[PDB]
Design an enzyme around this catalytic site. Structure first.
Site, PDB file in Angstrom:
ATOM      1  N   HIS A  43     -28.191  -6.505  17.599  1.00  0.00           N
ATOM      2  CA  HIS A  43     -29.376  -6.740  16.788  1.00  0.00           C
ATOM      3  C   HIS A  43     -29.966  -5.430  16.296  1.00  0.00           C
ATOM      4  CE1 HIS A  43     -33.025  -6.223  19.648  1.00  0.00           C
ATOM      5  NE2 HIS A  43     -32.006  -5.518  20.116  1.00  0.00           N
ATOM      6  N   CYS A  97     -35.049  -0.832  19.371  1.00  0.00           N
ATOM      7  CA  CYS A  97     -34.541  -1.189  20.684  1.00  0.00           C
ATOM      8  C   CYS A  97     -33.613  -0.080  21.152  1.00  0.00           C
ATOM      9  CB  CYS A  97     -33.793  -2.522  20.620  1.00  0.00           C
ATOM     10  SG  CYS A  97     -33.083  -3.069  22.154  1.00  0.00           S
ATOM     11  N   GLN A 115     -35.402 -14.118  25.160  1.00  0.00           N
ATOM     12  CA  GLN A 115     -36.521 -14.825  24.534  1.00  0.00           C
ATOM     13  C   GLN A 115     -35.999 -15.980  23.687  1.00  0.00           C
ATOM     14  OE1 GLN A 115     -40.038 -12.819  23.182  1.00  0.00           O
ATOM     15  NE2 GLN A 115     -39.217 -10.768  23.587  1.00  0.00           N
ATOM     16  N   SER A 138     -41.185  -9.311  20.878  1.00  0.00           N
ATOM     17  CA  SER A 138     -40.838  -7.902  20.727  1.00  0.00           C
ATOM     18  C   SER A 138     -41.066  -7.401  19.314  1.00  0.00           C
ATOM     19  CB  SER A 138     -39.376  -7.646  21.119  1.00  0.00           C
ATOM     20  OG  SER A 138     -39.060  -8.221  22.370  1.00  0.00           O
ATOM     21  N   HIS A 141     -36.227  -9.356  14.332  1.00  0.00           N
ATOM     22  CA  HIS A 141     -34.838  -8.987  14.589  1.00  0.00           C
ATOM     23  C   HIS A 141     -33.942  -9.417  13.429  1.00  0.00           C
ATOM     24  CE1 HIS A 141     -35.649  -9.040  19.188  1.00  0.00           C
ATOM     25  NE2 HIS A 141     -36.741  -9.529  18.626  1.00  0.00           N
TER      26      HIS A 141
HETATM   27  O1  LIG Z   1     -36.255 -10.134  24.832  1.00  0.00           O
HETATM   28  C1  LIG Z   1     -35.389 -10.803  24.301  1.00  0.00           C
HETATM   29  O2  LIG Z   1     -34.763 -11.695  24.820  1.00  0.00           O
HETATM   30  C2  LIG Z   1     -35.036 -10.485  22.844  1.00  0.00           C
HETATM   31  C3  LIG Z   1     -33.699  -9.763  22.781  1.00  0.00           C
HETATM   32  C4  LIG Z   1     -34.108  -8.320  22.846  1.00  0.00           C
HETATM   33  C5  LIG Z   1     -33.379  -7.194  23.155  1.00  0.00           C
HETATM   34  C6  LIG Z   1     -34.021  -5.968  23.136  1.00  0.00           C
HETATM   35  C7  LIG Z   1     -35.364  -5.871  22.807  1.00  0.00           C
HETATM   36  C8  LIG Z   1     -36.113  -6.994  22.496  1.00  0.00           C
HETATM   37  C9  LIG Z   1     -35.460  -8.217  22.523  1.00  0.00           C
HETATM   38  N1  LIG Z   1     -35.937  -9.499  22.273  1.00  0.00           N
END
Ligand SMILES: O=C(O)[C@@H]1Cc2ccccc2N1
Length: 147
Positions: A43, A97, A115, A138, A141
């Site tokens: 991502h 990230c 999430q 977050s 994405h």
């Molecule tokens: O937290 C989660 O499941 C999604 C996937 C992810 C990876 C890295 C940073 C944030 C983020 N949001």
């Protein structure tokens, strides 16, 4: 009729039908083609001021607005779709990230680890497909399913 999440819509500017996925926010002119325990995704994350942690390896204090973050995401998708820039290149350079250092790769995962909007979009993607903007606590994405 169509694979999970996909619907028909009409273009406002051209009148031609297109296809939209309300789980992944993908959209495309072509009719979509044709669930596993695990999927592998990369991502690109763009944080904003209402992210759960408004900080990243790129910026100690992330101050951009939700709307500014969405515009950046939209611009990256245009450059990926036009082939002007590769997904991996943009994730390495601009994802908020830490997975930016692995070209955005998150590895394999199952349902119940990520999430929910990210998970739902990830599992509705077919291998090789890419999402539109996916909203989580977050940030916003772009998700690429690799396995
Ligand atoms: O937290 C989660 O499941 C999604 C996937 C992810 C990876 C890295 C940073 C944030 C983020 N949001």
């Amino acid at each position: 009729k169509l694979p999970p999440g996909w619907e028909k819509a009409m273009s406002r500017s051209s009148g031609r039908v297109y296809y939209f996925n309300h789980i992944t926010n993908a959209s495309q002119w072509e009719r979509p083609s044709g669930e596993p325990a695990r999927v592998r995704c990369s991502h690109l994350l763009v944080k904003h001021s209402q992210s759960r942690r408004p900080s990243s390896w790129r910026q100690e204090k992330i101050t951009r607005t939700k709307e500014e973050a969405l515009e950046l995401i939209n611009g990256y998708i245009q450059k990926i779709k036009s082939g002007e820039e590769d997904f991996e290149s943009l994730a390495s350079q601009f994802s908020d990230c830490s997975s930016a250092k692995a070209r955005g790769d998150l590895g394999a995962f199952s349902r119940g680890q990520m999430q929910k909007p990210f998970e739902d979009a990830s599992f509705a993607l077919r291998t090789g497909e890419m999402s539109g903007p996916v909203f989580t606590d977050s940030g916003i994405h772009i998700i690429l399913r690799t396995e």
